[PDB]
Amino acid sequence: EINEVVVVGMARTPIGRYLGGLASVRANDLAIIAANAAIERAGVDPGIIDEIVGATCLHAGNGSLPPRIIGMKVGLPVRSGSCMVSQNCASGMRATEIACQNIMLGKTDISLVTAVESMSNIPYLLQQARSGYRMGDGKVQDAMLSDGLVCQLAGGHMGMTAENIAEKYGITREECDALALTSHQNAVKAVDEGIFDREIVPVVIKSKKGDKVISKDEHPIRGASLETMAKLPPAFKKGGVVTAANASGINDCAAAAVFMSKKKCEELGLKPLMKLVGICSEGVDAKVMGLGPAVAMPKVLKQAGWKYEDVDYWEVNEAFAAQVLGVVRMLKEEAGIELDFSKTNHNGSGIGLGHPVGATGLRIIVSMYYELERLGLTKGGASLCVGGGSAMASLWTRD
Amino acid sequence: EINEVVVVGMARTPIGRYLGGLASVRANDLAIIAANAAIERAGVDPGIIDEIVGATCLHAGNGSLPPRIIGMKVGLPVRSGSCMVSQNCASGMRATEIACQNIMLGKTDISLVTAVESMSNIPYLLQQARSGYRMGDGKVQDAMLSDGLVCQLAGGHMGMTAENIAEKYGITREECDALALTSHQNAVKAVDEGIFDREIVPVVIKDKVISKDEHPIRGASLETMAKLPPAFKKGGVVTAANASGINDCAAAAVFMSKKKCEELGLKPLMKLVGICSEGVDAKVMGLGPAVAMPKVLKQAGWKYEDVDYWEVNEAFAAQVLGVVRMLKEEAGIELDFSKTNHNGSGIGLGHPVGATGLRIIVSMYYELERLGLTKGGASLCVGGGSAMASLWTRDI
Amino acid sequence: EINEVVVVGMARTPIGRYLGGLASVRANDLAIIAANAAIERAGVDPGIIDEIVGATCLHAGNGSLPPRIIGMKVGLPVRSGSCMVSQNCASGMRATEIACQNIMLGKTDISLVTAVESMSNIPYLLQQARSGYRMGDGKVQDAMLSDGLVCQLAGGHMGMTAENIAEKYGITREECDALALTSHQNAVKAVDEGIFDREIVPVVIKDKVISKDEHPIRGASLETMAKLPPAFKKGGVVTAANASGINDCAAAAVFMSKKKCEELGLKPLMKLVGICSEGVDAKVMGLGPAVAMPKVLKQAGWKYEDVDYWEVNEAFAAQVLGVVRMLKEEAGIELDFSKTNHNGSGIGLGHPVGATGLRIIVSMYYELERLGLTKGGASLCVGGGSAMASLWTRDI
Amino acid sequence: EINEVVVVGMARTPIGRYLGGLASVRANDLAIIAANAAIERAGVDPGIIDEIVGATCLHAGNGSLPPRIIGMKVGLPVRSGSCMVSQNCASGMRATEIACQNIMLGKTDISLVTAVESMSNIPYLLQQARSGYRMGDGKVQDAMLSDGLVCQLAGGHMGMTAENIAEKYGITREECDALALTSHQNAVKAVDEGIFDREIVPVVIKSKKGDKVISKDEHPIRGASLETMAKLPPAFKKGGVVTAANASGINDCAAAAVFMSKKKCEELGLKPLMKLVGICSEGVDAKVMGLGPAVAMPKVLKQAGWKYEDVDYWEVNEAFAAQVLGVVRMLKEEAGIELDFSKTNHNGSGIGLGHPVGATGLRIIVSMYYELERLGLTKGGASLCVGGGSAMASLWTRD
């Protein structure tokens, strides 16, 4: 029969601003810092880790199979496995599943999962450079948009799909700005109070004149007020309800985690932090991808036999304020769920802290656990929508 | 209670030459052709497919999560799952594992796997364009190399790790050119004989049509191989002819739990027996198969002799000759070439990286079917070192 | 006291096709070949040449002040002067004027003029690369168009200004295709007959060699011209075949004061009589010659009848038919095609922009020499409108 | 016989910093501002100007025959001539010659000369984009270097040729920094005192929130001291004497001038500012291009029958401090000239004010005149070295 899987170490870097504090740190070097932190915290010798499952949305520019580069540099054995997975925003959560199911089936005993996105260092593409443009102008493409944020099925930017959710359920700019403010404010609150200090591993910038250190998330807007939110123009559509402040940002980050079979963790005398309960995907139409969590969360709860009210804390990534309010509505209408804001996103989410696409899937799992630990809770869950529709959700317990 | 996994449909496009007959068709449309072919050969309604696991080495330029695009265009339901996986050369073989483990654990009942590489359409990269070059020249990088064929751990192109194996085992070029020739000739023979016509779905150009593998060096002679200069090292044994080629191709397969196939009334073609990864040092990643094949065999309770036929990709002639030998010295295996790569391999037919991992699986089965055999296996080395191997049986 | 100006040596390379036989040779090395040819045909020691006036339309990609590089490689003394001039299509004809005015005023005694366009090697531009794109797609611009063929004043490609002339004078396509055909056929005839062998210096490829003009549409028929679609306007009279082509070529000439040529014991080939510019509105820049030819004729005291032969570049069939007519209506000139463009022109032989201005001068002379004639003239329209014209005589 | 030529109007924009105040103004729009200023100051109807001779070093990116665009936009008649000339740093001075010799020979009566270089907006090149890179990496080239500052004949940057002059004549870092300081200090002096206000025409940046105006040259280094000059590292060679402070800068600018036959200026009742006396080129080896002025200045003086001491004021462009000190030496050794620093570059030159390559050739002529006018002098001269060697010099008088 299948093994039980546990998490033994978890870490993430700060979430940097687009072209901000971490713009000088390429994705692989952020992954190495987060991976080393998780490995040390677990107390496992990197030489016995069986594989690395690396998550990222934009491979381009980071070399041949970056996860193999990241694994070898943190000391994985050359015998270890390596692969790179992408499910857009849920990349880190799908890497977690792939690794855990490998452990479930006995294929591995210890698996490293890295999730990273350095959106400040995504290159531009020259599509016709190989065979030549022959004649006439072409396009030098921003890969972060053409290969990531701009969905072909949706027809435009992710923000447009949030506008669809606002239209369908009739969400207004006032409701979006209200929710968005709390995220910026909650994020500001937790950042300055040091709530993220435990999970964070700092990133050190090796400047020539000196040596700077990034230890704090830097996306949230300080001094946000309900009237300041109302002063921003629409960011993606004329008269659209989505703005830069009520929409998740563009950001850099890397998260990592060490997973293990329950019995391997016991053999090594290590401390299991929490146990995988469930994890799965479930899609919605690309044009309303934001509602994915409203179908993934009930599904994973069914697979595990839990009721929504059983989960002690939730980390539901806020891609856009309208997107969240659409999830609340769909969860009330087509599910029997009244989203418990008192046990969900306590310290801000994507809107306030940012959305490093490739890292976020695992980021919210890391943050979920450490919030459980700070509040002495037991059962946690994390879900998030995905560009294209295929959303994910996962459930965990601290035994 | 763990579910049995069977393959109901498989397809692949012809293996086009670098900048050749398929250069005008992008990766996504190549994957769509193969997937539609595998779907109709399985005879399943694409509306009930639970997920797509898409393999490719270079995502750059192909849009947002191509596997989601590929799935929706071939008719997957919006509730289906989607993801992109890369294990360099074995990407197609890892996507298979991922989908098969989803079926093993009951997460899904029907999973579509696509594996594609359009190396003719890999874009070039401008790394400093976003923040600006400010002053001074920059680099317009060939992503095919910087993000694929050139490995930092190995210190250079994949061909250097082939040269490293040559030095380790003192493999001369004559052995490299001799193996390469038989790979080119075998590919030419099987292409002209139409052996690949069953597995192939043709690519229509919007009105020309490509339907034959076009990489094999025709008229290859023992001595034409000797006149070519080394390609990656001064005085090295690796040449363009005895090295795998750069190519375009797409392969697809529809997997299912055995209970689902019976319920739907379809015919399982072969059942998964074993699948696994196992790595070697990046400097000699070509030796990967020599550790992955004995492992998957041990995992499955199979001895090497049980396998009727193997599809073992030839990344480089020196690499294969190193695998033949490491298997002899550190394993108890004398590689049986009479039961391995009958119809040319990576050297003769080409190496469309993203698709190869699954391509050899497809070629494996149809050779089992053509020879009335039962047990088959496939394995391949991987850039970086993490090789893979798999075992299958038609005796469901 | 103003000095008399004579031409002692002239040369030109074959007119290669866009991305054709000369695509591998850059502008500078094409100019070096022509210049060396003109130098030895003049029989002058390049060490005493006082300056080089280099013409080209697209400097981008050819290094720092190419004319200085060209001069030093063909053996000009370091004390020599150097400069680059551009009047789009007439660049070669303006460089000639500049050098001839330097000789007229005693500033120099020997001036070398090179005129080159390697349109196959014009680079693409990244306008935002320096400061950064920050976010969002950008443009990779074809400089050949943005910095040359596409004119902002005219509102579009050079072909639209040809269409504008067609509407102004109601010129149908049948007239355009008919003139185009004779230009293609005449070019084919003269190419095969070796008439251009005297003026041509062949280009050696490092070991193939190009020596014949390769643009003429062979087997051109009245009805093949009618099946081609319009190229620049919906329902427009301009097609690729009746429009001038994109090409590569270099021409060179060594000018001298008549007193210097006698002092050195060399043979003057022809003497400058008149040269000037005169513009028209950019929207109908093709009509330029209809104002530049009567002006230079008036400037020189020559009537049109005095000129034995003309080389008038054909930018577009409609453009020439407009020039023929504006010359009739506003000037007293009925353009004598029996004494104009005997051996194909821009439509048949191509339009290597930077070189054309001087190329037609070279072709003019050798036709005068081939026919034993004396007085010659050359003129051409220019992107933007500032056309030029010149008059020459072998009766020094 | 040949006509006498006069200048009737002159203007230039401020010299902006590389990527500085004028980085948003493309070369053609700077040329239009300078051209309109010169035309208005001359008091000539633009509809009768016979031609425009446009000077610039880097055409790329500025459209089809920019001088024709610039001429039509300032109101030249469609009958007028147009052409673009380049002699690297002497581009503006060669455009002046071409136009003047056209007037000398009766080909034109009124000629507009524009000289511009917007080095902040020089594009990058993709050389193999047309036919394709086929396979392997290429180079995305900085055209300002590959097509301008980097000389193939010299083997490297212009700064290297200045190092050759320092080596040949044994010029030391101390002598270079001393001269360079005075240029920065003299430039600072004249800028703040408004000495350039007459010749300058301001450039207006049409920002959205507001409207900013550039009216002052912005290259000179404020607070320069002899010890601050000694603190900068070599900019182009190990242990080289050339630094960013003692080397001319990278800058944006446009200058323009209206030239006329003496008799055409009289017919229109206009005021001739000064009369062309002489103008010519003379080259030196590309590897020591800096010494060009030491051979061009004596030559033009011979053509005109003047002695060096006859010139009331000189504008000799300082490309590099070592380059100038080499000119002083060559003028003393191979010419009989003791460079009169008391009548040369009173208000700083290329080192202090900057070196917009395409505009400088005419810039120093404009500045030369207005310094003559401020000091009530009569005879002026302007010369400058050129990348590759072909240098130029010109002589003028206020009658």
Author numbering:
A (entry chain B), D (entry chain B): 4 to 402
B (entry chain A), C (entry chain A): 4 to 209, 214 to 403
Article passage:
Syntrophomonas wolfei is a syntrophic bacterium that is a leading model for examining how microbial communities degrade short-chain fatty acids. Syntrophomonas wolfei Göttingen uses acyl-CoA transferases to activate fatty acid substrates by synthesizing the respective CoA derivative. An acyl-CoA transferase paralog of particular interest is Act2 (Swol_0675). Act2 had numerous acylations and certain sites were modified by several different acyl groups.
